């Protein structure tokens, strides 16, 4: 059993799923032909009375930061952090059957993402 | 007023009257025109068609859309075996047909 928690905008949320991926382009002979691109983070969270994530997508237009912490035994195993990001997708779902009815799924597109001793940086000229 | 010379010799006063009339009607015929498409083979080249919009459409009082003379048409049958056509027209009282491909 794992415990994942998300710290965002001064609050705490319970995480259900998480993903992030990177990619490169490849020639017809199998040789890389571009740089690394990607780095979006997909999150699945349990909804509650608060609606802070929605007001961050609509009511505000400033970059933000946040972190996710994974615990295996109870102890801290890994931490994934982002800075200079935006929320580009949002979805709220209700299903009256069971198995966590009220949920929220959103996608973050940030410039810097960090996990462990690994870093990814994007060139956003100003 | 813009004046130009004739493109073919004229040998009397009535010759230039007829030459001028053909030029006027070719220019006036291009003020407004139509272009439609259908699936009916009763549309024939060089004949007249009367167009309208049905009264069952909402808010329509005037129904007439025009009376036209057919100047071109294209017929097609596709690989599934379906027929269709498209055509163009000038107003139905015009006495002079377009200049076309003459040089």
């Amino acid at each position: 059993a794992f415990r994942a928690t998300l710290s965002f905008a001064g609050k705490e949320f319970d995480v259900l799923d998480c993903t992030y991926s990177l990619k490169r382009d490849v020639d017809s002979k199998g040789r890389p032909s571009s740089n690394i691109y990607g780095g979006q983070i997909r999150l699945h969270v349990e909804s509650t009375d608060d609606t802070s994530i929605l007001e961050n997508m609509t009511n505000q237009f400033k970059p933000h930061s946040g972190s996710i912490v994974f615990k295996k035994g109870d102890a801290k195993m890994k931490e994934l952090t982002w800075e200079n990001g935006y929320i580009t997708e949002f979805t709220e779902n209700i299903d009256i059957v069971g198995s966590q009815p009220m949920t929220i799924t959103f996608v973050v597109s940030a410039q810097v993402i960090k996990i462990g001793g690994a870093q990814f940086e994007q060139n956003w000229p100003k | 007023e813009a004046k130009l010379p004739s493109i073919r010799p004229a040998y009397s006063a009535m010759d230039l009257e007829h030459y001028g009339d053909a030029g006027f009607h070719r220019n006036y015929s291009q003020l407004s025109q139509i272009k439609a498409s259908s699936r009916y083979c009763g549309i024939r080249l060089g004949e007249l068609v009367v167009t309208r919009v049905p009264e069952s459409f909402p808010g329509v009082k005037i129904t007439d859309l025009g009376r036209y003379r057919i100047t071109e048409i294209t017929h097609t049958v596709n690989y599934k075996g379906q027929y269709s056509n498209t055509f163009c027209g000038v107003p139905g009282g015009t006495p002079i047909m377009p200049w076309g491909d003459a040089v």
Partner: protein, 204 residues
């Protein structure tokens, strides 16, 4: 027989029925009419290689008839023309197919530049002279409106159609092919049909 399309098209080449995949026909009152027909060869019949391309190439200049019939109203359209081009081709080892191209007989009047002159004739007489030395079989209605005599006309390195198309139109005369005859002069045609938006007219 049931299961019929709204409009049925029939094609005959030299009097015999053609088995086609796609047709196309274009008609105008100030240009040539053109057709393009694709013919297919079936797997259980000889291919274009068993027959031979040069035996297919010997139906140049033959007659073509296209007739379209509307079954609900019983209205038809007819067209007669000639073949002027042939293509034989195949790809990837198939049996091949043939493409027939042509149009109205005036297309074969547009391939011969020359020099002539006419002195003191009228448009009625000049038209007959051009069509007399043609070699193409055609039927014509010769009724121009300008009946006076023109002192001098010159044909200056142009074809028979190009010379005639220029000369007749600068006098404001109707000069086109109506599908079975070549018309010279106003036919005085007043035949009306009705068409409605969303009723047998899919777009305006």
């Amino acid at each position: 027989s049931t299961n019929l399309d709204a409009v049925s098209v029939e094609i005959k080449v030299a009097g015999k029925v053609c088995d086609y995949v796609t047709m196309e026909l274009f008609q105008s009152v100030s240009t040539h009419h053109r057709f393009k027909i694709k013919v297919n060869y079936r797997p259980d019949k000889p291919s274009v290689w068993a027959i031979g391309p040069d035996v297919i190439f010997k139906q140049l200049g033959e007659k073509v008839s296209i007739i379209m019939t509307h079954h609900e109203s019983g209205e038809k359209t007819e067209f007669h023309g000639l073949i002027s081009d042939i293509h034989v081709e195949g790809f990837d080892g198939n049996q091949g197919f043939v493409i027939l191209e042509g149009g109205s007989p005036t297309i074969l009047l547009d391939r011969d530049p020359a020099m002539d002159c006419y002195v003191e004739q009228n448009l009625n007489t000049i038209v007959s002279d051009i069509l007399d030395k043609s070699g193409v079989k055609m039927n014509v209605t010769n009724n121009p409106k300008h009946t006076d005599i023109i002192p001098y006309v010159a044909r200056y390195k142009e074809t028979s159609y190009g010379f005639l198309s220029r000369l007749l139109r600068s006098y404001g005369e109707w000069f086109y092919y109506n599908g079975e005859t070549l018309q010279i002069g106003d036919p005085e045609i007043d035949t009306e049909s009705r068409a409605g938006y969303d009723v047998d007219l899919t777009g305006v």
